[PDB]
Amino acid sequence: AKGIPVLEIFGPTIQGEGMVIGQKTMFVRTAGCDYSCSWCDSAFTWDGSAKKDIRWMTAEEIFAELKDIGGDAFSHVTISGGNPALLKQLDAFIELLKENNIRAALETQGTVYQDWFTLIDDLTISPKPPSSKMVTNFQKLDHILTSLQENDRQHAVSLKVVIFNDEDLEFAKTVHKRYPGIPFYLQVGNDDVSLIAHLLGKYEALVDKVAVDAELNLVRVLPQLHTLLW
Amino acid sequence: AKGIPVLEIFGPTIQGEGMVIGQKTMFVRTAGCDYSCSWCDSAFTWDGSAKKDIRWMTAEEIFAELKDIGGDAFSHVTISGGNPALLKQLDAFIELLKENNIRAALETQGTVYQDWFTLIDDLTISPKPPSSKMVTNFQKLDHILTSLQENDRQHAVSLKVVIFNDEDLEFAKTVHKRYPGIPFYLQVGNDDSLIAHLLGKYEALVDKVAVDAELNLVRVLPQLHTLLWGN
Ligand code: MET
Ligand code: SF4
Ligand code: SF4
């Protein structure tokens, strides 16, 4: 259990949200989360239901399976969870992706810092809104973004906040106004219920609210391309 | 100086494609295109259908109307056409946007180069595929990207090639392999329900790139503005 807890490896596919939306990438979803958000779409990563399905793999084993699935049709890998920032062992895998000249992306809610953050080309910090029933530690969020700006990583970091209600939108203003020099992405909240027409109505409704708000000018409102496709 | 040929000024809205998709911005559409692409969705910018509807405004007049439409709910302006690169007069309007601390974006096919290219925060070079029946001058395209990489503007330039068939996809490989360092974008072409048809075209384009080894550092995106409001 000294390796990397891997849950699923699939691709190539398109990143459907965030800073690198549309990027063709391979996904390596790891296990473990320090959050228990109310609308966690990947609860199996932390509730223990997929504990038996965990495959503790080394860095070279993950890369070998990435080549058996993606072949040579990928140059970008996305690590997700869960909260992959909880795993310090990922440093060996992120370093392995760099040796093979492969760009790496990762999303974390911003509760724990790792030294290998400086190696991520597309680092997404995603603070969770109050609708998740999670308390946001802005002190730890400050330390992470400050450490990234000191290590000359501003070009690789973005902020993404999912919006389910008007209270989440006010939370996004607090995060955006606190870190003005960081690209800010607003994502539409998904409520599992022709859901494609229901989602474009939710996306357009969020765009209309941001269009009239003067405090959310340097933001990017995006939907989830994956849920619209599949 | 000289007035800027403006066709329409609206916003705030979101950018629906490419380098800064989803970015809230104000659109300032200029007139004049040195191309005549067969599927030009903005034919009125160059065919001469709306010569009377052109307002030759100065840099201060355009910025004044931007504040009347969007007020303080915008910090990003996108210049579209047409081919705004044919207008040297835009240097005054872009400098005015930088003075007011406003980011600027522009998309051009990449024929003519201007000095104010170094002032664009989100510059998109969009070479046209063979389906446009246009001839791509790669010798003239190399000059633009070389000038940007010399003026330390590689962090603000991207390539975007719209795809309608398999022949356009092979043209995107030639452009992507010719400029590896520049971020590359693939966009779905619209035949012009429309929404359910474009998703099938976007899904089909994703499946083709998913098994392609030459188009790896590529972002495949549709037209978001068409999926919400259509034509
Ligand atoms: C759909 S990928 C993201 C899943 C989950 N919201 C996370 O933070 O990892
Ligand atoms: S951070 Fe993501 S994976 Fe973790 S509980 Fe929240 S939604 Fe689920
Ligand atoms: S370059 Fe763009 S605006 Fe100009 S003719 Fe071609 S499609 Fe139309």
Q: What does the alpha-carbon distance between residue B97 and residue B60 come to, in Å, rounded to a whole number?
A: 10
d(CA A141, CA A144): 5
Does A15 show up as a binding residue in the annotation?
yes
Q: What does the H/E/C string look like for A78-120?
A: EEECCCHHHCCCHHHHHHHHHHCCCEEEEEECCCCCCHHHHHC
What tokens does B19 get?
A: 């380098």
Contact B112, B138 (CB under 8 A): no
Technique used: X-ray
Alpha-carbon torsion (A75, A81, A85, A89), positive or negative: negative
Taking the CA of A79 as reference, the closest ligand is: 1
Contacts 24+ apart (CB under 8 A), A65-72: A65/A9, A66/A9, A66/A11, A66/A26, A66/A28, A69/A9, A69/A10, A69/A11, A69/A26, A70/A11, A70/A12, A70/A26, A71/B213, A72/B213
For residue A154, the one-letter residue type is Q
Closest-CA residue of chain A to B23: A220
Annotated ligand binding at A132? The verdict is: no
* B64 C-alpha to ligand 3 centroid (Å): 28
For chain B, the first-to-last Cα distance in angstroms comes to: 35
To test the pocket of ligand 1, the residue of A41, A132, A226 to mutate (highest count of ligand atoms within 8 Å of its CB) is A41
Phi-psi region of B230 (alpha: psi -120 to 50; beta: other; left: phi over 0): left
Residues 6+ apart with CB under 8 A from A78: A15, A23, A25, A26, A27, A28, A104, A105, A106, A107, A122
Measured between alpha carbons, how far apart are the two ends of chain A, in Å?
A: 34
What is the position in ligand 1's atom list of the atom closest to the CA of A45?
A: 9
Question: B92 exposed, middle or buried (CB, 10 Å; 0-12, 13-18, 19+)?
Answer: middle
Number of inter-chain CB pairs under 8 A, A vs B: 97
Neighbours of A215 (CB within 10 A): 14
Helix (H) or strand (E) holding A159: strand A157-163
Is A226:A14 a contact under the CB 8 Å cutoff? yes
Contacts of A230 (CB under 8 A, 6+ apart): none
- Closest CB to B199: pick one of A74, A210, A228: A228
With contact defined as beta carbons under 8 Å apart, do A86 and A114 qualify?
no
Q: Map out the domains of chain A as residue ranges.
A: 1-230
Q: Is B39 left (phi over 0), alpha (psi -120 to 50) or beta?
A: alpha
Q: Which of B24, B216, B217 sits opposite A217 (nearest CB)?
A: B24
Q: What are phi and psi of B25, to 5 degrees?
A: -160, 165
A153 labeled binding residue: no
